[model samples]
Target chain A: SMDEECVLEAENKKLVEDQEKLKTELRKTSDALSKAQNDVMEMKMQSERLSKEYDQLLKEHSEL
Target chain B: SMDEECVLEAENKKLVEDQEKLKTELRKTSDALSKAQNDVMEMKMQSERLSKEYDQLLKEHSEL
Candidate 1:
């Protein structure tokens, strides 16, 4: 009967909604992680510069 | 009609599998982002510390 078809359609719609949500979440999370890693790499270099170029990190520059 | 049900079951199984994989990926990305943010906070501190601990960044350490 039409009842069986209607029930299947309802369930499929819900599944589609859930799938879209998870996909969106995954995309955003992925971008966030990539950017975070990218910033970390840059920060690592900056931190290194603070050590490697320690003179600038701390110096007469602060006074001026 | 059973054939129709069998195909539907197969498709849903694949959907769940993809969702599992993406969910796992999302978790890892979240952790990576979390860890990176922590490092940034620490780095900013180092920058500020270096600014104040200037001489230490320099011979401030050597003289000691």
Candidate 2:
């Protein structure tokens, strides 16, 4: 009665295991990506600040 | 003869489909993560260059 069902059950179990592994990997990768994006944004803002201040300093010296 | 086998076959097919979808998502997510990491590294280098130049400018002014 359960002959082929047993084989199918084993296959299903293996597939489910593989899926769980992939899910865990995806979650970790997504978390790292979000952190990287945030870091890039922070650095971009810092660069803008530096550039703006540098321009302001130059403008002040030119006026003097 | 193939009554319960049909049910098992359908279930197996569904599991396979789900696994394929997860694999695709994992691939896409990993690619995005790699790109984000590269972007962050590039931004960090730019910030270092800006900061160094600003410091040099300040030092020159103080000496004058």
Candidate 3:
């Protein structure tokens, strides 16, 4: 009957809509997460660079 | 009529079953995503910690 498949298809359509919505939300969230991870990595590198510069300065100070 | 009600009820039951199945699938997917996110965070933290430790080791080596 047209009614049976119609209802099933309707339900399927709703499921697809919901899954699409979730996928979109996940994409945005994952992007933000990756961005945050990158920021942390950048900060770590900067910290390492600064620490090296500071250590060099300390050595020069002690020698002088 | 009883037959009409039975048919409607059967349709309802089918809909409910389908919904449950989708929900279960979503739960598993969401759980996997959460675990992956946690793993990424752990790796980020570990990388930062190791970088800091390496810098400290270099500083000590230079001073000696």
Candidate 4:
């Protein structure tokens, strides 16, 4: 009985430690992915605005 | 002793499974959180850059 409890306790502790480790790793990966996505979106918007500006400039020059 | 050992083993297995499930959940959540943080940071940077450009244009217009 005593031995059983001790063994079970040890196993439980190990499982808890594993869970915590997983949580920490997940957090880091999520943060990096979020940052990458944001950068992509910003680049897309910048490109769109630049394209619009270029078009406007072309029109102005053509009229002149 | 035999019955007790078997019961203990069963409990250990259950706990192990629980830990695994928790780990998987943590990983997914962490990934999402990371992506969100990154996206926020990038948007902030983009906004700042645009604001600076706008200010520069205003200054040029004022000088003219």
Model 1: per-residue Cα lDDT at residue A17: 82
Worst 10 residues of 2 chain A by lDDT: A1-10
- Residue A9, candidate 1: Cα error in Å is 4.1
Better-scoring candidate (TM-score), 2 or 4: 2
- Cand. 3 TM to true fold: 0.52
Please give the CA lDDT of all the candidate structures: 0.76, 0.87, 0.65, 0.69
Instruction: Please tell me how candidate 4 rates in CAPRI terms.
Output: incorrect
The DockQ of each candidate is 0.35, 0.67, 0.08, 0.20
| Weakest lDDT window of 10 consecutive positions for candidate 4 chain A | A55-64
Interface RMSD, all models, one decimal each?
Answer: 2.5, 2.2, 8.0, 5.6
Docking class of 1: acceptable
Model 3 agreement with the true structure over B22-61: per-residue lDDT tens digits: 6675566566566656766775676677667767766775
lDDT of 1 by residue, B17-37 (tens): 877887887888788889899
Best by DockQ: 2
Q: Is candidate 1 or candidate 2 better by TM-score?
A: 2
lDDT by residue for model 2 over A1-64, one digit each (tens)? 5788889878988988988898898899889888999999988888999999988878878899
Instruction: Compute each candidate's TM-score over C-alphas.
Output: 0.69, 0.83, 0.52, 0.57
Model 1, span A1-64: residue lDDT tens = 3565556556666777888998898889888878888888898888887676665554544775
TM-score of chain A of each: 0.62, 0.80, 0.88, 0.58
Regions of model 4 farther than 4 Å from truth: A1-6, A13-64
CAPRI-style docking class of model 3 based on DockQ: incorrect
User: In candidate 3, what are the lDDT values of residues A1-64, reduced to their tens digit?
Assistant: 5576566557656766766666666666666566666666676677677667767766876798
Q: Name the regions of candidate 2 deviating beyond 4 angstroms.
A: B1-7
Q: How well is each residue in B1-64 modelled by candidate 2, as lDDT tens digits?
A: 3777788889899989988898898899889999998888888888999999988877777853
Task: State the local distance difference test value for candidate 4.
Answer: 0.69
